[PDB]
Amino acid sequence: ESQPRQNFKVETEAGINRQINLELYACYCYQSMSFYFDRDDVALPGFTKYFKEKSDEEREHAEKFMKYQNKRGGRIVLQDVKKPDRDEWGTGLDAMQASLSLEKNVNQALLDLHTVGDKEGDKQFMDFLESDYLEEQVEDIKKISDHITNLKRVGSGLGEYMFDKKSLD
Amino acid sequence: ESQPRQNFKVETEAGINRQINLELYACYCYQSMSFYFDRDDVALPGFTKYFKEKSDEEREHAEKFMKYQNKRGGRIVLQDVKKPDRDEWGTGLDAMQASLSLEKNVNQALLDLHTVGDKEGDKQFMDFLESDYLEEQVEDIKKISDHITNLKRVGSGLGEYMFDKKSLD
Amino acid sequence: ESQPRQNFKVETEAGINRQINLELYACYCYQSMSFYFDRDDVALPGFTKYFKEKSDEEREHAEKFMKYQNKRGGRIVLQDVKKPDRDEWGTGLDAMQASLSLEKNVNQALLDLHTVGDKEGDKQFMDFLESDYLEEQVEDIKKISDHITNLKRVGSGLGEYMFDKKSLD
Amino acid sequence: ESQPRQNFKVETEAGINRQINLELYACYCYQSMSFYFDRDDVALPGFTKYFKEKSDEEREHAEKFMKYQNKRGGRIVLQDVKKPDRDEWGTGLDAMQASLSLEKNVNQALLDLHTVGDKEGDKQFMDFLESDYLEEQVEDIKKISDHITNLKRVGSGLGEYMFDKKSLD
Ligand SMILES: [Fe+3]
Ligand SMILES: [Fe+3]
Ligand SMILES: [Fe+3]
Ligand SMILES: [Fe+3]
Ligand SMILES: [Fe+3]
Ligand SMILES: [Fe+3]
Ligand SMILES: [Fe+3]
Ligand SMILES: [Fe+3]
Ligand SMILES: [Fe+3]
């Protein structure tokens, strides 16, 4: 038994390892999205930078979980990170809708991980999840939803071009 | 009779109390408008901030009247502030037209309150109304009218999106 | 179903709407208290400013709940905000005791809303309530209690006058 | 007929001359009050400075009326300024009540002068009175009323001493 281990169950430890892989997968998806919009036949530089930043955020999420795993005395076990399910991401609206779907899947996984911690009485882990993940997911899902609404509002063509300039930094 | 009371009639005092309630109602209406545009299926952040600022202005109007009531030696009597007459405010153009209608109703109420002060010979109250309310109402009604004209000019979709970015801070 | 909605029940949504109305009611009560102490036959400027600040805080509480409602994908439904139950608030001690009673009622309502979120498994909403409301209520109830103790200690007359100068900014 | 004279009646001109004398009388009264509180058997330095400042304000009021008289093409006719009706002004509360009575008498005289301007159609004079005198009188009468309430609240002795330190600069 590792030196720090206290009130830390193997199921909670295994849940963190599977959440680490999912965060790395989201990181990979956003990285793919970012360079899709850097294609010369797509060429939307606001979308490129927006998804690059989200990719870096998801990598921070994964590493924070790795750090937490060590803090509690668990052991990181890494798996393959699967390639994203698409090579190309359509319009700015398509990519934003794919992004909402991804973020809601990540959120459900975090809520399920909270449920593991809850049944095992892992009081500190529950607060760590709420404070550093659940609140941010709620913020991001609201922001992406707003973006989707505005991408429908502006339409294709000049509208998409203007959204890229005005809504994304 | 209160210590400051001089040239201050009960009808004027009662008129101020009813104007206080109307200003609080306008405050509530703009607050509702503001958070309607913060909905994820509306998502117009310029409209949100614009109506939040107007809501704060109407609250200042109400409190200035409460302060004046005390200055003259009257007594504030508060009533329920009714919920706004709509839950949802349509397009940016619809909300701007509802706002013009509200501001003109407030202006007519102020003009009617000026008429009470005039017939009672309340010289100071008349100047207080003209200097701190009537002039501002004329400015606001002109600004909202301009906004309505431009919201018709730009049309729906990208036009509404652009107006949100360019005409509202 | 709105775009952001995830793990967000209609009972929780309805509880937030009723809490919004209660926060606006507390805002209205403190606004009434503030201008009661600005009366020329009361004339306690520390009390006036103290209750004005608390009124602004309660308005922030209401708007934060409106913002949260939108974040989760709920819909704000506003109701009449009832006028406060008193027109006049007695001595500084009476107003402070009315204020403690109000704050404890708000606190119980928040605890009841936490109970709704708990039974529905709304993990993020529970943390939002604890972090942004429950902690502040505990602080305020302790501060008001201290003020009540000191208002009894100093007595009426010069004591109330001195408390206004020394204990309220 | 003087060069600037336009829409300026002899009754309005005579009313300004009598108001000038009244402002100088108020100046003299406050000057007497100020040095009464500088007596070694009174010795309230906040009261002394407060009434000295009010005396200087009333002198400014008189001179502004003299300036206005010249602006419109009238002619200043000065009269004796009568000594104040008391040699000694009692307690701080007595002096504050005498001061409220004086200010209300000045206010009624200004309102009567406004009535002269109104019946003669002197539009500019009416606005000059409202903007530079009537508004300030309403402010001062409210402030003095507040002071009277607090002087009753604190009582005699230490209360009066504390009011002198805390409520008057
Ligand atoms: Fe993540
Ligand atoms: Fe994210
Ligand atoms: Fe207003
Ligand atoms: Fe005027
Ligand atoms: Fe307005
Ligand atoms: Fe609150
Ligand atoms: Fe509070
Ligand atoms: Fe004067
Ligand atoms: Fe004065």
Least Cα distance to A56 among A30, A21, A33 occurs for A30
Least Cα distance to A125 among A73, A72, A162 occurs for A72
C-alpha pair distances (Å), D120 with each of A155, B130, D8, D67: 66, 21, 8, 21
Contacts of A132 in chain C (CB under 8 A): none
Least Cα distance to C45 among C92, C84, C90 occurs for C92
Question: Do residue C67 and residue B39 have CB atoms under 8 angstroms apart?
Answer: no
Q: Which of D108, D118, D145 sits opposite B4 (nearest CB)?
A: D145
Give the position of tokens 């206004």: C164
- CB environment B63-102: b (16+ within 10 A), e (fewer): bebbebbbbbbbebbbeebebbeeeebeebbebbbbbbeb
Least Cα distance to C89 among C38, C32, C48, C156 occurs for C32
What contacts B155, CB < 8 A, 6 or more positions away?
none
What contacts A60, CB < 8 A, 6 or more positions away?
none
User: Rounded to whole angstroms, how far apart are CA atoms D63 and C26?
Assistant: 50
User: Rounded to whole angstroms, how far apart are CA atoms B103 and B99?
Assistant: 6
User: Rounded to whole angstroms, how far apart are CA atoms D77 and D63?
Assistant: 13
Contacts of A141 in chain C (CB under 8 A): 3-4, 6
Least Cα distance to D8 among D167, D121, D135 occurs for D121
Identify whether the C-beta of residue B158 lies closer than 8 Å to the C-beta of residue A153.
Answer: yes
User: Rounded to whole angstroms, how far apart are CA atoms D112 and C92?
Assistant: 40
List the alpha helices (DSSP H) in C3-122. 10-36, 45-72, 92-119
Q: Specify which residues C81 forms β-bridges with.
A: B81
Helix (H, G, I), strand (E, B) or coil at C81: strand
CA atoms within 13 A on the CB side of A156: 4
Identify whether the C-beta of residue A132 lies closer than 8 Å to the C-beta of residue B26.
Answer: no
User: Rounded to whole angstroms, how far apart are CA atoms D120 and B23?
Assistant: 36
What contacts C31, CB < 8 A, 6 or more positions away?
B63, B66, C51, C52, C55
In angstroms, the separation between the Cα of residue B145 and the nearest Cα of chain A is 24
User: Rounded to whole angstroms, how far apart are CA atoms A95 and A98?
Assistant: 5
User: Rounded to whole angstroms, how far apart are CA atoms C37 and C15?
Assistant: 34
Structure tokens at B21: 């309630």
CA atoms within 13 A on the CB side of A29: 21
Q: How far apart are the first and last CA of chain C?
A: 49
Give, as one character, the DSSP assignment of residue D92: H
Interface contact B168, partner A, CB < 8 A: no
Identify whether the C-beta of residue B92 lies closer than 8 Å to the C-beta of residue B166.
Answer: no
What contacts A79, CB < 8 A, 6 or more positions away?
A17, A21
User: Rounded to whole angstroms, how far apart are CA atoms B122 and B116?
Assistant: 9
C-alpha pair distances (Å), B125 with each of B108, B115, B133, B134: 17, 11, 11, 12
CA atoms within 13 A on the CB side of C25: 22
Structure tokens at A75: 């052991």
Closest ligand to D19 CA?
Answer: 8
Number of residues in chain B: 169
Q: Report how this structure was experimentally obtained.
A: X-ray
User: Rounded to whole angstroms, how far apart are CA atoms C5 and A141?
Assistant: 9
Identify whether the C-beta of residue C12 lies closer than 8 Å to the C-beta of residue C129.
Answer: no
Contacts of D111 in chain B (CB under 8 A): 7, 123
Least Cα distance to D24 among D71, D75, D74, D64 occurs for D64
Give, as one character, the DSSP assignment of residue A83: P
C-alpha pair distances (Å), C67 with each of A97, A124, B24, C64: 23, 28, 21, 5
Find the helix packing angle between B92-119 and B158-166, rounded to 10°.
50
User: Rounded to whole angstroms, how far apart are CA atoms A165 and C37?
Assistant: 52
In angstroms, the separation between the Cα of residue B5 and the nearest Cα of chain D is 9
Question: Do residue C6 and residue A127 have CB atoms under 8 angstroms apart?
Answer: no
Question: What is the CA A119 to chain-centroid distance, rounded?
Answer: 25
Phi, psi of B92 (to 5 degrees): -55, -35
Structure tokens at A36: 């899709």
Tell me the three-class secondary structure of D93-127, residue by residue: HHHHHHHHHHHHHHHHHHHHHHHHHHHCCCHHHHH
